[model samples]
Target chain A: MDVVSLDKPFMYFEEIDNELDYEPESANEVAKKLPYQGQLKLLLGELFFLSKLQRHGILDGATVVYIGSAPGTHIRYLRDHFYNLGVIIKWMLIDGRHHDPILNGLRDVTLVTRFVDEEYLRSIKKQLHPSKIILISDVRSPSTADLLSNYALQNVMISILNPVASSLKWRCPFPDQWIKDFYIPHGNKMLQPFAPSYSAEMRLLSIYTGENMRLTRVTKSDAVNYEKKMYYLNKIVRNKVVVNFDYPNQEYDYFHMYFMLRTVYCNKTFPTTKAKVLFLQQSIFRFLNIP
Target chain B: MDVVSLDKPFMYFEEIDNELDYEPESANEVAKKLPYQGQLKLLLGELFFLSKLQRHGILDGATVVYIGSAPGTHIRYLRDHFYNLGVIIKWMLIDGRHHDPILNGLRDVTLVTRFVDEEYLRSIKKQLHPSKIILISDVRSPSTADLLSNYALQNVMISILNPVASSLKWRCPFPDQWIKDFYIPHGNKMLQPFAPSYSAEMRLLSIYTGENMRLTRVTKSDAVNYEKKMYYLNKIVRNKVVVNFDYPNQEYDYFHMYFMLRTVYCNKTFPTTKAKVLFLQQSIFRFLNIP
Candidate 1:
């Protein structure tokens, strides 16, 4: 195997005429095989979300665990195009709800279900190489809230869920409401900023990128800005007040808001006297220094 | 060493401290040892930023690289409280820029003048474990922008330049513009979305986290909504006209508005056969369907 630097994923793929080596089929063929979407919106939403992750390099060596959604239709879509997009990784379904394997191969896309506990989850995480991402999609399993929150990261909580069908659920009515009640408050601190992508009609479908992953910044008018602005409306407005300058960030904001809010709400003043000089930072657009 | 699951970091710190034990000191002691900040705001802002990553579970085993700024004043602070905050990780400083080593322990923190190529960077990365985040902060070295963009992710742009002095610059003139030109088109696509946290005084201070990281959603209030709304604004006002029900999300609008706007703008027409049936999806709060 002609392997390159693990630091740069997708900087891979060797062409060998030898029969022993595996080869991937072209994407055009794969696209034709996929049934034309009656729900083109949902399909593309998930794809766009996945592409966002791919752009962030989050798909490198990702471990995707799809729970509850009875296989075939969904995960295969992920496997097919992910390979089409040159994202190479593992697919593991929790519990027995898997479908027929798509590209069941040695080291490539294949459906393999194995029973594992949190202990297994822990061990597997141990083997992760740097810059690789991990995403556990509980696609509309409202019960998986606690489980999803366990990743200790917030990006997954707000990730697109399933297609509108699984997400909106006629019986469950509003699955976002279910996630809001069940998952968001499951006592997991990391899960706070996550709100369902109901408008997008998704559950946990967003690709999981590790901390190394970065997405577009929220500036003036995006809805995420509105929600997060509301979520940390205090911090957003008070950003200059405390002078932590840039306190919370992409995922960093998740942590910053968590602690800042804790101190504010808890009435426990931050112990560090290092914060006082923030008085100067209050000036908006003043210095414009160093350029 | 008795090991627990990677599923839980920070949680197992207590159990492992028994034998060849190097126990972490309490947060209070660590807090007191550090000088009380007359510049509390900047300190807290950076701390808050650092703490933000910690809450996401992203800080475990993170690799922080500080370049140009001669150490002590800044990196020492990160080491001091990061450990106190229960962030156990490694720190490396490049070149003669390093100052007195704090903590000065094994495998914990080190200051080494190592001239490494991308190959070495890749090797260090391969040596990384799961849930680990690698953030290379090229402090004050404007030349490092190209190298930073080479990280393959965009969020790290504008994180924090200096503690106060290096950050404050002999004073604080403008950092974001420095970042805007140096950091913005530094060649990476995702990094472009990040703007400087220029409050008139500084630039490149706050790290940018786009909506996907959930600071907000791409819906309603922002630029996407306007562009999208305009695409369908003609369609919305044209309700009695074409019938593409949920015409907003996915590449849905890409095609919907693509066709609709052309009709609105160029005076063309869209067939009712495809869009008419999409009407069933417009549930007010029913599905909260596609925003």
Candidate 2:
């Protein structure tokens, strides 16, 4: 057995940047640089953990995953560029909250299910039963990070983990530090440890800021700037303050899944104000009760 | 019969200014006063004519009415707003020169026939048979327009008109001056004067020009200045020229029916330029092809 060293966690940044620029040569180059054996195993381990988490008895063998994001960039990357990554083993997308009327509309879901021949089920078969994989998302207001976390946690505890505890290891790679700092630090320590051997992982990654950090890089171009004169123009001033949060330690058990939810606000019509970005970042961490 | 007297043919502007600000009351008040009766009647008549035209010889009757036009304010108004008036109408829309895949690709006119139900049949019953109406346009492209016209004409003549001539009128509307102008005026002679009484009394009410346009007012607003610029840019650079023919006055007949095929350059994004408006007006007259 080879030990995969995770020395340069950000080594994939070059690949991501190149892929963003649509350089096929760079994408090929990234594909060729396979992770060391231990790193590969680590990646597999993450997938196995995610699967177990999804299969926990409390989930009742059912797992619902929601993807509320944009098209062309992230979706293209996940579906086309990152093939064989085992990251998105099984997933279906609800285009946006606006698409809810069509997606969850009468007979539409059933018709789609039959037309696609249950392909969504086959995608997430590693951890959840074909009938158990469900997708739900508000395409309109996609920033339901807290709602998603609560939903997943509740499902795991009530339906999936409660029934199948005997057959599963509920604490294979428990992020004890994360649990203590982010979740438990808020004084709610009653929740049991998550099962260790679930076959799939559900990670929610949000880009709150564009600063250089341990887990990711927040480029200056991503920062929002506003003049002091414009500060008193409204209820809230732009770029009035610079606020930052410590990045989460990568040693956590769950594989990091990235989300560009906040970046959509950077559209030309509503360029993100520095104050707004900082406030948003703070709100996210505060909501998660992570200090 | 009540006679509505007017010194000149009603243009779109005489009754009401497109620029609402010129009115004594609110814009809504002026809009409320603008007569929709003539435009609506004309639209109804055109639709009726097309519908009747389709049913002449088709076996199964007409199920679908595909309407196409050059991208313009008039077409947009017709497609989006006008179609909505006919409630319970089971119609699907295809923009531009695109053909309905199910209808054109299948080449199975029977499928088109089956797709329409009693309600759809009932909607266009008076105008055309339940199986014959198939409205399509080539979006102002001369070649496409010619091709579609020829194709539809062939279908009507060979599969419909030739077989059902006795039951059909040379012109759907007879004894009306406008209908005559539209249907027959050739060599100052009425070839098929003994047509049935089916006139819809469709006529243009008024025309607007200079600063009297609604779009011009909207463009002047500070909030939408950028949109105004884009509209002007599009009109000056990318505008396509179209030619319509006019014929000498005669009575209602088959040739006049062909003349009703009017062409207008529709620009929904911007206010219609003077040149574009003049061109459309001239084209309507030119469609007659008589000196």
Candidate 3:
């Protein structure tokens, strides 16, 4: 028996190679086979992000309750990866849409066209009792957040993927560190003034920890800007990054850069007010050629 | 007859007092009279914003098109102010609801419960052909921006009152300067990480100038952050403002503070990259009590 690993950086597989390995495919080919419009880099980025958790047996022998629109290629990739890993069986797909023909053909993957609420989860929980339940969604709707707030299932872990500016606020039971640490970038050029891009600015947040995420005391927009900046910076090479003060950024990239520099240079774990001020001063002094 | 001005800083009138002057009333009373849930400060702020342009005869003798939800107390105050000023006349209220009993009583004030579109505007234009049309709305629907993009009303000027985090983007045909300058701050305490505040964050943008507002070069979130920071700063006293670096703000207040300080100290009209970096350094130096 031969062994292969598909969980490598930038390795986006089109299909399962045999059983253990996935057949690597080009970005264009991966995008074409996708049912929904998405970036190949993001698809790979999220998969890579998820694989880290799967390795730790977080998703091992779990029943995934997907509650979002159009599962598409995501379900296919998800199912294959779980199957290859020999875990994450019995997907209870719940959405407002009818059962996808392709998804229906897959064994143990049951599709239910229904809204996800406390009642629905309770009904499913009764049948899948004692089994580890992992609820995951990439839905860009407020209802998901609402459902999360209302949800109170014990021993059930939740993972959500959304843009920084998403309405998934402090209601979700995950810390800022959990979201900030797993900040996934688009692998492509960062868009100016990050208007709601479809999938280019999504991040995966699979949380098993029972830590309560505190809502930012600052304004919502400011919090979003910080998270987004860190996400963009994570994708860039540290050496290549420069504090360019030549042109004014409408999105105020310089502001975030100060924080990033503080984090990188000062080796600060989390951004503080003092650190930011110090960084701000250093940025200006350096720009002025003042040592 | 002694001439009186109704355009005082915080005078939200409950009723018209003998034409020229409006009798001042409590915030509670003003809120009661209003058909919508809004702050008295915002109402006064927006009215004051409009008054500045109204003084220039910009809105003089124009056929005001009041779109969006129920006109409420806004129309009453607007009518009284214009009537007292002996300027803006011939009100053509356009909304999706039937005429309010109170608004119907006012002379020359007509209500049309119809959808706002190009054909509707054309039809209205034909009747008021020679009159200057000042289309004003407080509607939070996306359709308003859609209508503006499709609208070819050359002579008609548009004024929209909405939150700083509104969908009204570059398509509205107004520069950042125009929006930035006429930012009407609510005379209340600043809400942290400025969430989608209904009336607290609304700015008045009455553009008679045909300057095409360029789409922001930075990410959308960054652009919003800049605008919001400026809006908050404008309300605060220059001398009282302090660069507090002790406590960290979830909304990244420190980041914007650097920009604000740069703008204030440098006397820069618009925020520049160089200015921000320079300010960042100055803030650090000041905090450390360094010369």
Find the candidate with the highest TM-score and give its number: 3
The candidate that wins on DockQ is 1
Considering only chain B, report the TM-score of each candidate against the true chain B.
Answer: 0.36, 0.22, 0.46
Off by over 4 Å in 3: A1-291, B1-42, B69-71, B142-200, B210-218, B223-291
Tell me the tens digit of each residue's lDDT in model 2 across B1-291.
Answer: 212222222111122111211222222322211133323323323333333333333312334343232122222333332233331232333343433233332222212222222344344344454333333322212232343343334223222211221111111111111110111101111111111121111121111122111111101132133222222222221122211212232222212333332222243332534444344334432432222
Residue-by-residue lDDT tens digits, candidate 1, A159-194: 322111111111112222332211121110121111
Q: How well is candidate 1 docked (DockQ)?
A: 0.10
Assess the local accuracy of residue A32 in candidate 3 as a C-alpha lDDT between 0 and 100. 28
- Rank order (by DockQ, best first): 1, 3, 2
Per-residue C-alpha lDDT of model 3 across residues B17-57, encoded as one tens digit per residue:
21211122211232222223242322333344455546555
Correct interface contacts retained, every candidate: 0.25, 0.00, 0.00
Model 3: lDDT of residue A228: 39
CAPRI tier of model 1: incorrect
Worst 10 residues of 1 chain B by lDDT: B189-198
Better of 1 and 2 by DockQ: 1
CA deviation > 4 Å runs, candidate 1: A1-42, A57-69, A82-87, A103-106, A114-117, A128-131, A140-200, A203-291, B1-291
Estimate TM-scores for all models.
Answer: 0.25, 0.19, 0.27
Candidates' C-alpha lDDT: 0.32, 0.25, 0.38
Instruction: Give a tens-digit lDDT track for model 2, residues A222-279.
Output: 1111111111211121111212222332221111111121221221243444444444
